[PDB]
Design a protein around this ligand. Structure first.
Ligand SMILES: C=CC(=O)Nc1cccc(-c2n[nH]c3cc(C)ccc23)c1
Length: 296
């Protein structure tokens, strides 16, 4: 028997109840028959990889504690059987990674403003309330849905990848903190605002690390019509010396965040449009043969 809190109520449920609508891991899309809620149900097999299961349970632990942060995907409850743990979670629409890939181009600044409010408050909550330093902020961990909601993902939420790593995580100016995540947020925002990841030509992880340290920090192009506010926020996030890079509390007073705390933005529509538009309908194209051998 599982115990679900959803829809304002408390339910005692049999894992069997849940109508399976298919895999989305392993994560299943499932309908709770008693209410009509559609949810994501994560399956942790008792036999599974011991490292995966460790991370899943750490993440789960932080999520169970985070009911009062509106910017983190919520857990509705759990079921424990002899062979599994099933974890009922809020079902979103997509990760911003998927969304950038579907669109093949930029996310409008107004959507990214609402996104920055959400994600900075999520990260700050985690540090202030639970001592957690997320360490893996990237567009695959930013989730959106058709209600217009933008939340930080449970995956890795309990606290890396070369592309979003800050200078001080590669070579700190003194060996022997959340500002590394502020950098990753910056890189994420430049990537999504442009549709181009800032270190695209890199063919290896070490090469990426090299650009981070040797090159000027990436910027929002000054010619695309991003607001002065947005350019500043990104520029602050991408401060190479972590010692002068702002903490979340300072970011939360920044004009970019502050304006988008109350500016009306209809993210639900923009989301619905973009998902309809970019549905691949039919228009399938035969793939090209490999180039045959040739002697030059
Ligand atoms: C990187 C892509 C991605 O995460 N895509 C995606 C697309 C649509 C919904 C979710 C999602 N919503 N709620 C979740 C809860 C868990 C535990 C995992 C994924 C999701 C995730």
């Amino acid at each position: 028997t599982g115990y679900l809190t959803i829809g304002g109520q408390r339910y005692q449920a049999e894992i069997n109840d849940l109508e399976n609508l298919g895999e989305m891991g392993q994560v299943w899309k499932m309908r709770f028959r008693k209410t009509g809620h559609v949810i994501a149900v994560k399956q942790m097999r008792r036999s599974g990889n011991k490292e995966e299961n460790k991370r899943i349970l750490m993440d789960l632990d932080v999520v169970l504690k985070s009911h009062d942060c509106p910017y983190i995907v919520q857990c509705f409850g759990t079921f424990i059987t002899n062979t599994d743990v099933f974890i009922a979670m809020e079902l979103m629409g997509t990760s911003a990674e998927k969304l950038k890939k579907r669109m093949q181009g930029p996310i409008p600044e107004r959507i990214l403003g609402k996104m920055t409010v959400a994600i900075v408050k999520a990260l700050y909550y985690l540090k202030e309330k639970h001592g957690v330093i997320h360490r893996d902020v990237k567009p695959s961990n930013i989730l959106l849905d058709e209600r217009g909601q933008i939340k930080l993902c449970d995956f890795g939420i309990s606290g890396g990848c070369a592309a979003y790593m800050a200078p001080e995580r590669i070579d700190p100016p003194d060996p022997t903190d959340i500002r590394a995540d502020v950098w990753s947020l910056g890189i994420s925002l430049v990537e999504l605002a442009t549709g181009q990841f800032p270190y695209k030509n890199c063919k290896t992880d070490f090469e990426v690390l090299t650009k981070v340290l040797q090159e000027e920090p990436p910027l929002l192009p000054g010619h695309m019509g991003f607001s002065g506010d947005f350019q500043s926020f990104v520029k602050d996030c991408l401060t190479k010396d972590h010692r002068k890079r702002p903490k979340y509390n300072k970011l939360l007073e920044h004009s970019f965040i502050k304006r988008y705390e109350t500016l009306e933005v209809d993210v639900a529509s923009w989301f619905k449009d973009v998902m309809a538009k970019t549905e691949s309908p039919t228009s399938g194209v035969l793939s090209q043969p490999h180039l045959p051998f040739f002697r030059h």
